[PDB]
Amino acid sequence: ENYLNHPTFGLLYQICSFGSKELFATLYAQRLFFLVAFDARGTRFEPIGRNEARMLVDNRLRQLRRDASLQEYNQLQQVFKQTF
Amino acid sequence: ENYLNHPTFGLLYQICSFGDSKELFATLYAQRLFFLVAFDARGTRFEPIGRNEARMLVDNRLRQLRRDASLQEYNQLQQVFKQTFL
Amino acid sequence: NSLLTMFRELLPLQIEQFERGKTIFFPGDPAERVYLLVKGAVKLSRVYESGEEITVALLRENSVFGVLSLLTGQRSDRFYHAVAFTPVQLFSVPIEFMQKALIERPELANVMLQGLSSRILQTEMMIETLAHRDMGSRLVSFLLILCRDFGIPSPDGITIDLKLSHQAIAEAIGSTRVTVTRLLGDLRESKLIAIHKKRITVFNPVALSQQFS
Amino acid sequence: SLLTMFRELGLPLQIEQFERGKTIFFPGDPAERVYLLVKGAVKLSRVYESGEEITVALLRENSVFGVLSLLTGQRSDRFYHAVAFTPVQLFSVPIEFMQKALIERPELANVMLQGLSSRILQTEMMIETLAHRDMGSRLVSFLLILCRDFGIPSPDGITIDLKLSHQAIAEAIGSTRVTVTRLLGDLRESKLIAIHKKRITVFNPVALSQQFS
DNA sequence: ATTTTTATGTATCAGCTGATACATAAAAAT
DNA sequence: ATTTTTATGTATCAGCTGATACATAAAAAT
Numbered sequence: 001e002n003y004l005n006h007p008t009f010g011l012l013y014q015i016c017s018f019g020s021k022e023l024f025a026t027l028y029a030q031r032l033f034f035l036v037a038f039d040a041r042g043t044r045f046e047p048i049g050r051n052e053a054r055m056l057v058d059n060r061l062r063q064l065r066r067d068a069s070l071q072e073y074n075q076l077q078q079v080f081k082q083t084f
Numbered sequence: 085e086n087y088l089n090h091p092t093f094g095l096l097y098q099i100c101s102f103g104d105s106k107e108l109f110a111t112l113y114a115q116r117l118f119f120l121v122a123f124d125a126r127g128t129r130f131e132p133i134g135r136n137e138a139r140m141l142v143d144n145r146l147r148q149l150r151r152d153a154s155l156q157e158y159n160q161l162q163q164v165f166k167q168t169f170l
Numbered sequence: 171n172s173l174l175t176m177f178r179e180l181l182p183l184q185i186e187q188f189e190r191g192k193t194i195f196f197p198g199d200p201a202e203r204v205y206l207l208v209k210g211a212v213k214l215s216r217v218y219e220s221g222e223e224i225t226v227a228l229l230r231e232n233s234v235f236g237v238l239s240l241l242t243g244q245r246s247d248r249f250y251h252a253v254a255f256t257p258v259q260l261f262s263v264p265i266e267f268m269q270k271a272l273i274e275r276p277e278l279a280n281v282m283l284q285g286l287s288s289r290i291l292q293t294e295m296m297i298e299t300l301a302h303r304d305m306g307s308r309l310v311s312f313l314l315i316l317c318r319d320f321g322i323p324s325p326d327g328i329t330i331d332l333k334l335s336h337q338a339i340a341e342a343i344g345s346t347r348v349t350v351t352r353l354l355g356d357l358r359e360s361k362l363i364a365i366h367k368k369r370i371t372v373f374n375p376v377a378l379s380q381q382f383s
Numbered sequence: 384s385l386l387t388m389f390r391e392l393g394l395p396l397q398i399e400q401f402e403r404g405k406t407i408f409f410p411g412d413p414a415e416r417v418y419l420l421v422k423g424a425v426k427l428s429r430v431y432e433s434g435e436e437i438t439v440a441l442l443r444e445n446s447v448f449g450v451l452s453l454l455t456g457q458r459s460d461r462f463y464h465a466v467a468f469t470p471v472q473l474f475s476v477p478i479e480f481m482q483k484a485l486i487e488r489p490e491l492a493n494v495m496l497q498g499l500s501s502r503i504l505q506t507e508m509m510i511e512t513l514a515h516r517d518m519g520s521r522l523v524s525f526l527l528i529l530c531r532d533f534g535i536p537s538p539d540g541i542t543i544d545l546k547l548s549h550q551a552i553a554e555a556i557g558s559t560r561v562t563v564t565r566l567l568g569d570l571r572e573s574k575l576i577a578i579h580k581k582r583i584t585v586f587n588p589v590a591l592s593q594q595f596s
Numbered sequence: 597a598t599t600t601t602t603a604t605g606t607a608t609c610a611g612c613t614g615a616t617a618c619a620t621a622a623a624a625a626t
Numbered sequence: 627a628t629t630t631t632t633a634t635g636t637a638t639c640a641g642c643t644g645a646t647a648c649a650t651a652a653a654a655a656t
């Protein structure tokens with residue numbers, strides 16, 4: 001529900017926030033996954049592979065589950081569930 | 085109807101043969117680009133040109149053939165000229 | 171933005187302004203320049219003797235075009251119709267002034283290869299769209315791309331920030347204007363999009379993309 | 384020249400062999416290399432989970448592919464199916480060993496840009512073909528292109544030098560195999576084409592090209 | 597502000613083409 | 627050479643969607 005636009009790539013949609021570095025995926029058929037850091041001196045974009053972008057969210061899931069709220073864990077699981 | 089295989093733009097089809105032994109060739113689909121081919125021993129070099137520059141080149145060849153050659157050769161180029169530019 | 175940074179330094183270079191509808195280059199022109207759209211949209215189109223238009227690619231900001239000039243140079247003539255579909259700002263460097271500047275600055279050489287590579291992928295992504303049999307799937311596949319390129323965040327959904335005439339669309343997806351107005355009317359009812367003032371706003375574009383995975 | 388330059392990215396660089404139908408890269412394989420098809424043909428395709436395969440482009444000799452690796456880097460993953468449509472011989476340089484090779488020899492940097500340009504246009508020519516409504520016109524437009532790239536001069540007409548199944552074709556122009564056989568038959572009786580030894584042959588392709596002005 | 601030019605919504609029906617199935621040939625595997 | 631997989635020829639249908647016209651709204655021009 002949050003969209004940022006890498007200039008060569010075009011619009012990207014947020015998947016999860018690591019904690020606040022964030023992971024953004026390409027809009028059409030999620031072909032490329034990009035790690036974005038909101039540094040004060042500009043946004044930075046780093047592409048990563050599908051297999052890898054998966055485990056990175058995985059860890060975040062367990063962390064929402066064991067330390068945080070019920071709501072948030074479910075929401076991320078939605079995105080995860082859909083994306084995979 | 086005489087063909088030549090360009091590395092990049094694929095098949096090219098002959099338009100006419102000039103007295104300099106140089107020959108004018110054109111792209112197979114839509115006549116998008118024109119080329120001047122010169123056959124050196126290991127040359128077979130390609131020289132791209134525009135349609136305007138390419139028209140007049142055939143134009144010269146039109147006049148030469150009629151005055152010093154058979155009508156049919158002149159007519160055969162005229163066919164090509166007629167179809168290719170008009 | 172490197173593309174934007176590097177082009178700027180080809181003394182400096184001043185930016186060209188094109189008014190809506192005004193043509194950049196026509197077919198037959200000597201292709202002697204390489205362009206870099208900075209802002210706005212550029213419609214590349216094929217035009218038949220019959221007078222009909224086929225939209226090849228609808229470019230986005232930081233998109234490199236006029237690619238024919240890198241092959242043959244100022245010798246060969248255009249065959250596509252480059253129109254400024256939206257008020258546009260762009261640069262224009264002569265191929266020759268470029269060819270030399272590429273060898274001088276090897277940092278710029280790579281910047282260009284990446285930009286052309288996007289176009290190949292973008293142009294290829296278009297193929298996928300038109301390659302659909304179902305005009306419904308095809309339209310949407312197209313609308314998805316527009317959100318990716320010209321889309322802006324709007325609360326209900328992503329609104330592409332451009333105005334599209336039914337025909338303009340019909341020309342892009344290989345169909346008639348009638349069917350366009352027809353299909354759009356279906357997507358309104360299906361409550362997947364919304365139209366105000368010629369602005370197309372999709373709801374959860376993500377969901378729609380999920381179809382094609 | 385693309386053939387000459389690639390051979391200098393090592394000390395010598397070795398030529399890979401690929402058998403018919405053998406796949407070069409598959410969707411989800413990491414893209415670590417830039418490739419150069421030297422001999423034969425290569426079919427790039429989008430493959431859905433439904434199993435339906437959509438041909439994005441059928442590359443010819445001296446064509447540069449793996450364009451995604453240049454911008455993405457090894458990290459990202461392929462989204463297309465690179466299949467050897469015919470017996471093929473190609474080169475393969477890791478992009479990292481290419482970017483270093485670009486700045487060392489900017490003359491090669493120039494050669495490449497031209498190569499990618501051709502790709503853009505060739506992929507754009509495809510857009511044209513699929514942009515037709517009339518499946519008849521679309522098939523022909525496609526066949527023209529085939530004559531251009533894979534075609535070999537034959538006395539009656541240009542014969543494409545490749546083995547093409549009706550499905551393989553149907554996958555290329557965005558239609559069903561049935562409609563392919565159907566239409567082909569129509570062009571058989573109209574005596575514009577001919578199929579012998581499972582190889583296609585158009586008659587005076589130039590005349591067909593004129594219809595498409 | 598009035599008019600008149602362009603864009604959108606709606607109506608129609610005819611025909612191609614996708615979907616489905618089978619026959620048969622050609623090819624590949626065994 | 628035997629079988630069995632893949633490719634091509636033909637049959638059948640239903641439903642888009644192209645083609646044409648009209649209505650209406652929106653925009654541009656005056």
Ligand SMILES: O=C(O)CCC(=O)C(=O)O
Nearest residue numbers: 201235236237238248250
């Ligand atoms: O390169 C040309 O002259 C026509 C096509 C084009 O401009 C492009 O691909 O950007």
Ligand SMILES: O=C(O)CCC(=O)C(=O)O
Nearest residue numbers: 448449450451452461463
């Ligand atoms: O780069 C890729 O992996 C997919 C597309 C491609 O290979 C190309 O367009 O040449």
